[PDB]
């Protein structure tokens, strides 16, 4: 529930903790789907930028498995609709690619 947590995980998974990316998608999707007030609170700077990088890097590797597997697709779409809610062009185009 602390927004500093979401910021820290998004920044870490992009460089120093990059070796956990496949599991990090689960951790982030969980945080965003349970803690509803994060959709309305003010975020730390660059949070959206790091999330854009993570999701775009994951889909580039995992495209076929995401298309063929319901649970992975639902987990990814939770981050993408959060990004589109905040007005991300990159998130929007990524949904139109996944569908």
């Amino acid at each position: 529930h602390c927004p500093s947590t979401l910021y820290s995980l998004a920044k870490s998974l992009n460089n120093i903790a990059s070796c956990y990316l496949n599991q990090g998608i689960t951790w982030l999707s969980e945080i965003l789907s349970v803690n509803k007030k994060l959709w309305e609170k003010k975020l730390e700077n660059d949070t959206v930028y790091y999330l854009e990088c993570l999701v775009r890097r994951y889909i580039n590797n995992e495209r076929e498995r995401i298309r063929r597997t319901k649970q992975l697709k639902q987990e990814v779409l939770v981050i993408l609709d959060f990004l589109v809610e905040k007005g991300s062009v990159v998130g929007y185009m990524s949904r139109e690619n996944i569908l």
Partner: protein, 199 residues
């Protein structure tokens, strides 16, 4: 002095049951699951309009005035294991999977066989699934017991004690006690050599 069981299983499924029609495989899977779900020997399946007659002429399915039934037991076990694989591929979350497959005793045996085979073939995707089950909540305890029986019967068994050490020890040894109960109940076999020596 042993058989290549996987090749034998593959040849028999593809050449006897499927042949070349998807509609045959769909009909057979639905028939076996309906028997195991309703607790019935004779059933009336909702197949496509001529497939049960083709399976009766092949001798896989039998007919009597009370309904249709399956001739050999080994094929019914194999059908339930494939059905579990499909429900695993299509699930949204683990709780929905355990709700989908039901809870009757033939299904529990089929689940235990399926886990044991994934462990033997070293499919690493099962390890997160196992960890999610062993750590998770809301899942009824008898599913965890079937999983631990599968582990205790598998040659891999020692690895899991290295992974779950703190979980085994710290929680008042409660799981370790259940392991001894399951071990003494399920993991035993008849000693026909000693019976021969006793006459």
């Amino acid at each position: 002095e042993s058989i290549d069981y996987v090749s034998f299983k593959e040849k028999l499924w593809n050449k006897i049951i499927v042949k070349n029609k998807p509609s045959r495989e769909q009909c057979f899977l639905a028939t076996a699951f309906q028997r195991a779900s309703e607790g019935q020997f004779f059933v009336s399946p909702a197949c496509d309009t001529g497939i049960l007659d083709e399976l009766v002429k092949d001798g896989i399915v039998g007919y009597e005035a009370a309904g249709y039934f399956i001739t050999h037991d080994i094929y019914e076990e194999w059908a339930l294991e494939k059905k579990i694989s499909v429900d695993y591929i299509r699930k949204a979350n683990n709780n929905e999977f355990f709700e989908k497959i039901g809870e009757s005793l033939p299904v529990r045996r089929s689940f235990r066989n399926w886990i044991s085979e994934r462990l033997l073939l070293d499919d690493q995707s099962i390890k997160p699934f196992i960890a999610e089950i062993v750590c998770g909540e809301g899942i009824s305890n008898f599913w965890k017991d079937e999983l631990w029986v599968a582990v205790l019967l598998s040659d891999n068994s020692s690895i899991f004690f290295n992974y779950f050490k703190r979980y085994l020890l710290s929680s008042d040894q409660n799981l370790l006690k259940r392991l001894t109960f399951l071990l003494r109940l399920a993991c035993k076999d008849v000693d026909y050599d000693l019976l021969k020596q006793l006459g």
